[PDB]
Amino acid sequence: EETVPLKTLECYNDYTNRIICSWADTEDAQGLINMTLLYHQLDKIQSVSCELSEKLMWSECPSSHRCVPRRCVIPYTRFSNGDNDYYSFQPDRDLGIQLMVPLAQHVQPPPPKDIHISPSGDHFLLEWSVSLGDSQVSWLSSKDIEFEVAYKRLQDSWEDASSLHTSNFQVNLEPKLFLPNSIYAARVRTRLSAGSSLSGRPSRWSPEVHWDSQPGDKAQPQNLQCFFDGIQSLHCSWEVWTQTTGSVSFGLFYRPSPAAPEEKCSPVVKEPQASVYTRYRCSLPVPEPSAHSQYTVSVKHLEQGKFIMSYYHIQMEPPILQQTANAASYSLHWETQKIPKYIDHTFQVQYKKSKTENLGRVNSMDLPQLEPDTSYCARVRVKPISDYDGIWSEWSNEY
Amino acid sequence: EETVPLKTLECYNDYTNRIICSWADTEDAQGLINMTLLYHQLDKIQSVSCELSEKLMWSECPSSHRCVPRRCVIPYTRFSNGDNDYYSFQPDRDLGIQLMVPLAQHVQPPPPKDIHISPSGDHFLLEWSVSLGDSQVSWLSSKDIEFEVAYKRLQDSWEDASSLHTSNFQVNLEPKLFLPNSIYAARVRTRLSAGSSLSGRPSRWSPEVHWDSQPGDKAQPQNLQCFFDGIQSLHCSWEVWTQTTGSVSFGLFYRPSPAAPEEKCSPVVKEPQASVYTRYRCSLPVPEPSAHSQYTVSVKHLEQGKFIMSYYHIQMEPPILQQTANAASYSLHWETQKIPKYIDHTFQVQYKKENLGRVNSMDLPQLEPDTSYCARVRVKPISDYDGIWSEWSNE
Ligand SMILES: *[C@@H]1O[C@H](CO)[C@@H](O)[C@H](O)[C@H]1NC(C)=O
Ligand SMILES: *[C@@H]1O[C@H](CO)[C@@H](O)[C@H](O)[C@H]1NC(C)=O
């Protein structure tokens, strides 16, 4: 803990009259403060007139710093064997600071600790402990002490968070104080009674405690918060559970007064977001704020749909197959039909053992020849065409 | 942004009797919400009955998602060229949310902005603006608005920060609201005057803005503060300018009542701490605190110095020479005198790169090649008195 100039001191007597001393100060520090040397002989005080060499005569500056050299001579007409020398350092300007601290108005109580989060039931049990030692009466007790607990959900900063005050050493937390599907954090600090004489800083913030809020519907949007900027705009925000947003789309509808036609807010903005909840905000103009105006705002699901008509057609059909080679096997026939009656067909056939041909709307088609192996295989389909559209029917019977 | 069921919906038809449709919901959603499919016709609406499919018949799943297909059939005998087929998805539950907001009581004023940090010679000016609109009567103007500024040192957390309340669009920040050479930050928000009928939330914070406070001694330590933990202890903390600790040590002292003798509080603990400052802390005890007990705490410079006496000495010690190279080569003379006379002397001569007595002359064996030079000596005390070996002489 030794200061620089004192370690850099060696002072050696020349024995005629004088004493010569060599010391140093740091080279960043000479700018901030200068030092004067004190020579102590019985009662004298006596500040030493100092000068600065280019190098420490008798010592080495600590190599971390680089040093500033000093060379001082103290003329001493007479020594003795009993002369007694002490060299001390002090600053040339009297610096230091002093504070009056009335104990009453400077009390900062001890923090709470041993802090446990437990559910007992529908409720949530926040507990803490505080060490006042003893005596039971020493300067503070159950009075004048009180407590402040702050809870918030993780994504929130503490700066804005709700707060409770109990003289009790535990507080019961129930929902409606909480947004269902999120992680919450709580911490306690010890506060002085507003209702007491004693003044000062609140206790250190306790360590945090984390827990998951009661479960919730998850499909439903939550956190509907709408606020008015006092000039012709109202800003509403809400949260939906992220996994829902593929299933449902939401939008925000307002009516001024519970009379006016419902009106749709745009735009709706999507906060990015990686969180388990996804936040949404929309700002709606409010052009004629009445004195007492009650806007009524709701989050309803947007509409999702399409026209399919038809124009869209599938069906399906069987051939009857009366042979496999080694004989005269003529044509093929398709039974059902499922008879459409309005609209054209363009039936399709295939054969052998990817080999096909295109056809008209004909209840049967003729085969050129096969011979060895077996008449097999041949399959059919039907695709509505011309006026009407659709998709090929699933394949039939055989292979 | 269209839901995965609307993307995945393909209804296709077999004109005889029924229609069949294929669609999906997100994998994730499966535990969460049951969607239903609606067949829109004319007057009817009529929710489709659907069941779960192994695969999506006519559609690929949306590129991002993975999905869970449904297959739905509907018994429709009657058709037409004019027929209008519309299918729409909706959750089966009534799920949705409705909130009334009387404007008067939920108001979040426009935040401060275009905020400037302004120094004067002595004071500190703090500027901003607020956009309040027109007509000059809209619902709030000079009132029901108020203000709150927080300022803190760059190193502090805003959680603990000093706050101020004005009705005005600027403030003059007295120094002595501010520690000396150091860097402060500040922000402002708009609030509602207590007098207001309007209720709401204080506005968002204006942006932070940064400046460095009045210059100061800097050799002096600032920011002494002490707290009484209400049982038997008082905790103090102070800063110094870090590169001062090379020149000076400080310590913490206390007087319970001024009349009382100064005690030195120990140990003094130093925080590292990364900055231009270095923070120190020390906690000192208490007696029974008197109800009004007044304590006095000071940081002074700790005593710094070391003893010498003599018991330390140094000197210089000339020889004269008889000659060099081939005339008389033995002994040497010493001078000066320079008379200590109280103490042992033990001068020492060397040619070799030899401890001698209080004697002022040495003799040597010699050689007589070459030339005698160079020959050195030294002067010091042993026994009762002591010092550093003197510098060699004239050689
Ligand atoms: C040290 O002394 C010189 C003149 O003797 C002066 O210019 C300088 O400012 C002093 N240093 C400090 C830190 O005051
Ligand atoms: C709605 O979803 C639940 C999920 O638990 C499912 O069991 C139920 O069958 C669905 N509703 C109907 C009417 O099938």
Curated annotation (Swiss-Prot), chain A:
Highest taxon in the source lineage: Eukaryota
Bridged cysteine pairs (disulfide): 11-21, 50-67, 226-236, 265-282
Glycosylated position list: 34, 322
Parts of the chain on the Extracellular side: 1-399
Cell location: Membrane
Span of the annotated motif WSXWS motif: 392-396
Domain Fibronectin type-III: 111-216, 315-399
Region (Disordered): 195-216
Domain notes: The WSXWS motif appears to be necessary for proper protein folding and thereby efficient intracellular transport and cell-surface receptor binding.
Subunit structure: Heterodimer of an alpha and a beta subunit.
Family per record: Belongs to the type I cytokine receptor family. Type 4 subfamily.
The protein's role, per its UniProt record: In mouse, there are two classes of high-affinity IL3 receptors. One contains this IL3-specific beta subunit and the other contains the beta subunit also shared by high-affinity IL5 and GM-CSF receptors.
Name this polypeptide is given: Interleukin-3 receptor class 2 subunit beta
Full-protein interval shown: 29 to 434 of 878
